[PDB]
Structures are given as C-alpha cells and as structure tokens.
Design a protein around this ligand. Structure first.
Ligand SMILES: Nc1ncnc2c1ncn2[C@@H]1O[C@H](COP(=O)(O)OP(=O)(O)NP(=O)(O)O)[C@@H](O)[C@H]1O
Length: 341
C-alpha cells in the first residue's frame, strides 16, 4: 500500500531548506514531493525513500549513478536533472528537477488511445537522444517503460485534437502536448558495462527475450524495451499483456517472429531450459501452458503489421524488435532511419 510511504503534510520543512507543497507521485521505493527551497525559491522534486535499510543502500547507488550521468547539455541529454542528496533522519532524500506527467499518464488521460503519429516521431527522437547518451556512457537503464519517461513541461500544457483511431478509423479526440521534450527517470536498477549483471531485469512486460531465456544481457536489452514503449505509444496498450514467461515467449513468436534456433539452443544450457523443447529445438508451446485461456490469449495475438498501420513506423519497429539482441540497431543508427527524417 501507499500508506507505507513517508508521512507528510503541506508546510513541512525538510532539512531546514525544502518546503513541502504537494505529492507528485509514488513508486514502490520512494515518495516524490514537490518542494520549494526557502533560500533560492526554486522548485524541486524531492524523492523520499522508505525507512528500510536495504532501500537506503540502493538509493545511495542510485544517487551515485545519477551523479555520473549529469552533463552540460541544454536538455541534460534528456536525463532527469539530479541536484544532490540529504538525510531526513532515517530517510534518504534525492533532489530532482520538477517534471510533468509520464507518457503513460497521458495515455491514461487519452482513454488508452495512442498518440498521433507526428507526436510519436518527436517523442521517439528525444528518447533516442537519451539512449544514445547512455550508450556512450556504457549504461543500461534496465527499466524502460512509459511510466519512466516524463514530460519535460511540469505545467502539462495541452489541447484537444481530432484523430482517426488506428484500429477502426473512428474519429476520436485526444490530447496533444505543447512540449514534446522528455526526461528519463528511475535509474535505481541501472547497470554499467563493468558492473554486476543480475539474472532478471526490466518490468515484466518490457523484458527482453535474452533476459527471459537467461542468455545474458547488455545495453541492447534496453532497445527491446524501447520497441515495446513505442508500440504502446501508438496503440495505447501493452504489446505484451502477460504475467508469465512462457506465455510471454509464445506471444513474441505470434506478434514479431519465431525465436532464432541458436538462441533456443543456448537456452537449454541455462535457466531458460524449462521453456525449450530440447529435442525439437522449439518453444515448449502449447505443452507448458497454464490454462486454455492462456492458449486462447496467445492465439488472439495479432502480428505487428496488423497492429501498426503506418508503413515507415512498422519498418522502424521491426528493426528495433529483433529477438536476436546482436541484430538490434544502436540509437545512433535509428536516428538515421527514414521515419525520423
Ligand atoms: N522529477 C520528477 N518530477 C515529477 N514527478 C516525478 C519525478 N520523479 C519521479 N516522479 C514521480 O514519482 C514516481 C516515483 O519515481 P521513481 O524514481 O520511479 O521512484 P522509485 O520508487 O525509486 N522507483 P519505482 O519503484 O520503480 O517507481 C514516478 O512514477 C513519477 O510519477
């Protein structure tokens, strides 16, 4: 529950500097409050991490990672501006720039309809600037999702526009934002090239095939998540609506492409073994399904080209959503794609 988070009140004075105004959002580890500094009058987003000692330790690592990637670009290379940290008694507090709602929240306000394709193009360019920078810093975010991409404008300036819905061609109204600038947040699980690599990364629905199949992962795993984000920005819904790995894997074959024979072979030697039919070198589907509903769910999955009506964006998305991680393009290469010109 969200009651587990830091107890606050309007008019609170944190560390003899920050005046609490309101709550901006909650995670599972931290509560983010909008604060005004009493010395400079500037506004900040203060993330108050929970009392627990293990979350304090990870927040320190998060602070450390954030500090390393702060730069002098105009838009901070589309990475959330981090200004420093302090302790409020037992609480770790991280100081950020104040940002607007997530791209997910905007989807929610738009009735889970996708953004207009013109706006998708611009969000895409801006997210890629951030990913290209992280690549140059040898950093894998590991938690790319529309919830972790915030609108640069904290005032959320928008107006209603008319769009033909992608599914049926029905004329509907959605919100277009004035600003198209974005910032990446939530660098807690972020991993440098030289650092330790965990077995499971990503939010389940944005998880890369090589992570699920336990084949080892690198910075190219972020690229798979990015493709899921983009599909969601277009349709307003998750590309992979699932809660278990086996179903998730079978969905990948129905929507994108069959899993490369070499990857299924390398999976038999790892913890991805339980997903592979060793003899036939194929997915253990529908053998290892959990119910008939799970099978009907995977059967109901349309291939990507039926979902993505735009031709250049479809080609763009297939480039990204490559099951083989070695075949995925880098952010630098994607910025040269015809769709973004
Ligand atoms: N700079 C910011 N400006 C405005 N809102 C923010 C900002 N940073 C975070 N938030 C909001 O606070 C929520 C939690 O931020 P986050 O850094 O993800 O917290 P966390 O608990 O450490 N990680 P997670 O458990 O994965 O959410 C986000 O989902 C946003 O809604």
């Amino acid at each position: 529950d969200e009651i587990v988070h830091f107890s606050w009140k309007k008019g609170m004075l944190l560390n003899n500097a920050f005046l609490v105004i309101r709550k901006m959002g909650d995670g599972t580890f931290g509560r983010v409050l909008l604060c005004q500094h009493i010395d400079n009058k500037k506004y900040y987003a203060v993330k108050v991490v929970r009392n627990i000692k293990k979350y304090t330790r990870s927040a320190k690592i998060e602070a450390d990672i954030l500090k390393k990637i702060q730069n002098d670009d105009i838009n901070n290379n589309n990475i959330v501006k981090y200004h420093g940290k302090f302790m409020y008694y037992d609480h770790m507090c991280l100081i950020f720039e104040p940002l607007g709602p997530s791209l997910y929240e905007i989807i929610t306000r738009n009735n889970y309809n996708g953004f207009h394709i013109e706006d998708i193009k611009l969000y895409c360019i801006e997210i890629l600037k951030a990913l290209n920078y992280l690549r140059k810093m040898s950093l894998t975010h590991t938690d790319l999702k529309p919830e972790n991409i915030l609108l640069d404008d904290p005032y959320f300036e928008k107006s209603l526009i008319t769009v033909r819905r992608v599914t049926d061609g029905k004329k509907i109204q959605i919100y277009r934002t004035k600003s198209t600038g974005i910032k990446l947040i939530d660098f807690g699980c972020a991993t440098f090239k030289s650092d330790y690599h965990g077995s499971i990364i990503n939010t389940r629905q944005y998880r890369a095939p090589e992570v699920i199949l336990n084949l080892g992962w690198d910075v190219s795993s972020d690229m798979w998540s990015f493709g899921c984000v983009l599909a969601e920005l277009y349709t307003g819904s998750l590309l992979f609506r699932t809660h278990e790995h086996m179903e998730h894997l079978a969905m990948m074959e129905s929507i994108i492409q069959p899993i490369p024979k070499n990857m299924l072979y390398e999976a038999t030697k790892t913890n991805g073994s339980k997903y592979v039919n060793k003899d036939e070198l194929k997915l253990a589907w529908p053998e290892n399904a959990s119910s008939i509903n799970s099978i009907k769910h995977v059967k109901k999955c349309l291939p990507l080209y039926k979902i993505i009506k735009h031709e250049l964006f479809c080609d763009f998305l297939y480039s990204i959503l490559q099951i083989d991680p070695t075949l995925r393009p880098s952010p630098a290469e994607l910025l040269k794609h015809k769709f973004l010109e």
